[model samples]
Structures are given as structure tokens and as C-alpha cells.
Target: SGAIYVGNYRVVNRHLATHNDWANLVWEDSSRDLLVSSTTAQGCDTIARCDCQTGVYYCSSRRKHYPVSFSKPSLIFVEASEYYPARYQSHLMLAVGHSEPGDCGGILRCQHGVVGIVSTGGNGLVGFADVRDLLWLDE
Candidate 1:
């Protein structure tokens, strides 16, 4: 009921957190919370920030922002739940339910790229955190 094991190693960005976002009712203006969850842990993946996406890209900045509106239902682990949060400003905080069998919230994907990250979890709902915010760009 946790991360996938690979050659005696738990393959995770760091630690697999169960912070499933519920709604956009509360906006997380900081990464203090998510930071702790994804923070470095014992026997965890020691990947460098360079191993992640760096540099800049085009100005698709006006894609969308937080406080998203529900868009029907999205596919999460093949569970049918309201894939709320219709934004693209580098993918906004998508509001999804706790359809997770045990634990989850790695990222809300669209079969293309990252949709967003997890913010707060409660009331059987979860609010997503945007990468743009993590990137800390006022663009």
C-alpha cells in the first residue's frame, strides 16, 4: 500500500505522501506543507534538483490559475472522480476526491504532462499546488 519497490529501493521522488487534495476552497500560498511531505527522508531517493525540469519555456503563462472549476470527471488510478480545476497556467490546483484506495497524490496527470501537486487534504477532498508557484516566478 505504498511506493513501488525496485531493486531493494522504494522508487519515489522522495517519500510517497498520502496528502490527497479535496477542494480549492482553501488556497496554499506557500510550499511549507508540501515541502515537509516531499522532504528528504531516510533511504529515500537522493535526486538533485537538476534531475528535475529546469530552464524556461514559452509564455503559455495565461493557461489558468488556482480556484479551478470542475471539469466533469478525470481519470485517476482509473477511478472516476470530478477532475476539477480547469487551469493551465502551468496546470492549476486540480480538486479531486480521495478515490485513492490507501494513499496517493503524486500528481494529477492528463496523459501528457504534470497537472499539478497536492496542497491540503481533508473532508475527503484535496487541493492541488501548482508548479509555477514552486518555481517562484512572477511572470
Candidate 2:
């Protein structure tokens, strides 16, 4: 089990059309697998925590513990759809799911290999990748 590192972040996944959600992270170290769910504004700031090792995605914020079952023990890549440019950074919104290749939308640049924030709008997907390399959102 790991701590809720990326908890209560205003990020979005490609599954939504707006930024009305946040991500609750439950990450496993051995398998590098992650479980993420959508939460509302108040749901993101509750006292509930998660234990990824036990797969206990308990969030009183939602009044339930949701479990994410996976078919594989690896991260699934999400395709990039469009890029929202900002004065400081550019936001990349991914497509629905695994789909055809498109033009380069966003670029991820980080230091050494480490786990960090990966999101679209208000959705964040927990995964591992180097900030120095360009990485797509993984589910």
C-alpha cells in the first residue's frame, strides 16, 4: 500500500467532456499498476484514504470503496486528442480509449525516472514514467 500522493488534484481524464472531477489514486509498487476513479469537488477533499496493496479504494468522500479490476497487470495507454495551450504549459486531452494515432498533442518533460502527475483536464491517471520522456496518459 502507498500513500495518496496525487490526491485531490484538479485534473481530468479523457472520459469526461468537462473539468467537473478529480482523481483518487491507488497505486501498487510491485506491478506498477494503478487504480483511479472520478470524484466531485467535495469528494476530493474528504478524509478517506486508499491502500493500493490491499486494493481498498475506500473513500468516505463517496461513502464507498470502489475496486478497479484489471485484465492485465500493466498500464493502458490513452491516446491524445487535442492540446490546450497555456501561457506557461500546454494541457493535453486524450481520446476516449485506445484508438488510432494522431498528431503529437502534448509533451511530458521531467527529470530522472519517477512517478508524477499525469492528467487531461480534471482527470489524473496513476502511472510511472520519466518526466524527461514524452508519455501518454495511462489507465
Candidate 3:
């Protein structure tokens, strides 16, 4: 149920870490642990750095910094549960549930270039943002 096959090659980026550019990728075997995934620069750069799984665009001065025009990247999560309050879209890009599914309604929603929270139902949840008001969420 992890990665599905699309063609002769695996549909998912299972071997995405094989490339030198993906050297920063660290696999997570636990269901409760966070996974650090990353991609190389779009063009002309093989330098890649681990990205925050929780929608934070952390940069590494040791590697290479993103260009000023580069918007903060986001990772879309595919989620589903037996039962939940919200009917989330298949591809939702935001840091969602922290503990239990019913605990938090939804973490963030960035649509039409606008980003914000549907609800902050957890203990300590940082708010949301858009490209114009891009900011970091604190712990």
C-alpha cells in the first residue's frame, strides 16, 4: 500500500534517493515519525537539502540558498481515515493532524494563492500563510 506501480518503473519516487541530488533524503520506518524529503534545484544545481515535513522551508547555509524569487516549497500529503469530521481533498498540501485525526480539523489550506487555517483544534498549532505573507511556524 506504500508505492503503486504505474508502468515498468515504479509510479512513486521510491528510488528518488538514488540520485546524488537526493542525498538528503532520510527514510522513516515508523508511522509516527516525520520524513525529511527534498529535491534538487530545478535547473543547473545538484545541491539538495532536507525540507521540513511540516511546511517550513528551512535553508542550509552549508549547502546552497534558494533564490530570492523562489517561493517556499510545500509537500502535499495524501490522507484518509475510517471516519473524520472534514472531507479533505485527495491532494492536501499542509501540516495536518498532530496526534489524532479528530483532534485537529485541518492544519492549513492554501488555495487561490491564499493560505490559512481552517481550524486550530490542537494544543499548540502555528497558524497558516500565503506567498505574500509567507512566515515560519513555531513549535
Candidate 4:
């Protein structure tokens, strides 16, 4: 009863070579337990605003709606982040699901210096995380 479907999921080209493809995402996580939280872009439209509590994901005027499973594809961990106007102060709220050995397993949010943001995944305007460098890209 909680399955909504559509076909407007776009692929972020630059993130193609990397491990950000839909196939990789669907293939990586089999459990399909992750959640599609909220998304933001510096100057672009919001791809989709997800309601974790309600499991409802809504796209902007130019996108389609996706089911909860669509967002949870291979996302062993889910997180909620916020960027404030203050300097040296960014709030990271995470809801991690699982991780392999030596991986940041479990959900750990509010861990200072443990989180970073390199890019904003806007709705259709932006598709993948664009880190400043590799060092910052690694979680």
C-alpha cells in the first residue's frame, strides 16, 4: 500500500563514472530500508522533499514522484544535514542504517568534525555530491 511509482529519475552524468548510479544504488543495498530525506541546492530548484516520518517523497514541478524504496536503494546509511549562516558551524543529522567492517556503521549524527559537505544534490539541476576534493569526499 506504500508504493508510489513514476519515471523521472535523472542520472547525474559527472557522478556516472563514480559509484552513484541507480544500478549501483539498487544493487548495493538489498534490504531497501533507507529513507529519502530532504534535498537542497545552492541556487537550483529542490529535486524532492522527502518526509521521513511519513515516507512521502514529492518532486518539484519538473519531476516525478518516487516510492520510499527508490530513495533507500543501497543507501546503507541515511542522514539529514543543515547549513547555517554562522561560520565553522554546520549541523549534520544522520540516520545511518548499516555498514561493513571498519565502516562507520550505525547512525551517528551531531558528531562534530565527523561530517562534511562538498556538493548539494539539487532536484534536476544537481544530481550528485560534488566534493571539493577526494579527501573531503570520503565519509
Candidate of highest lDDT: 1
TM-score for all models, in order of appearance = 0.29, 0.20, 0.18, 0.16
lDDT of 1 by residue, 26-114 (tens): 22322222322212234422222112231111111222222323232232221222332432222223343542322333443332234
Q: What is the C-alpha lDDT profile of model 4 across 1-139, one tens digit per residue?
A: 0111112222121211233344343222112222111112222212232222112222333234322221221222223333212222112222212212112111111112111111223223211121112231122
Off by over 4 Å in 3: 1-80, 84-88, 106-114, 118-139
**lDDT digits (tens) for residues 1-139 of candidate 3:** 1121111211112212145323544332112212223433322211122222333221221222111112243332234443223333222233322322222212222222123222111342221222222121110
Local distance difference test values of all predictions, in order: 0.30, 0.24, 0.24, 0.21
Extract clashing residue pairs from model 1.
Answer: 21-125, 21-126, 21-127, 22-125, 22-126, 22-127, 64-88, 64-89
**Candidate 4 least-lDDT 10 residues:** 108-117
- Deviating ranges (above 4 Å) for candidate 2: 1-9, 19-52, 58-63, 66-73, 76-139
Clashing pairs in 2: 11-122, 11-123, 12-121, 12-122, 12-123, 13-123, 109-131, 110-131, 110-132
Which ten residues in a row are the worst by lDDT in model 2? 98-107
Instruction: Give the poorly placed runs of model 1, Cα more than 4 Å off.
Output: 1-96, 99-105, 132-139
Report each candidate's C-alpha RMSD, comma-separated, in the order given.
14.2, 14.6, 15.6, 17.1
- Give the Å error, residue 33, model 4: 21
Question: Lowest summed lDDT over 10 consecutive residues: which window, candidate 1?
Answer: 54-63
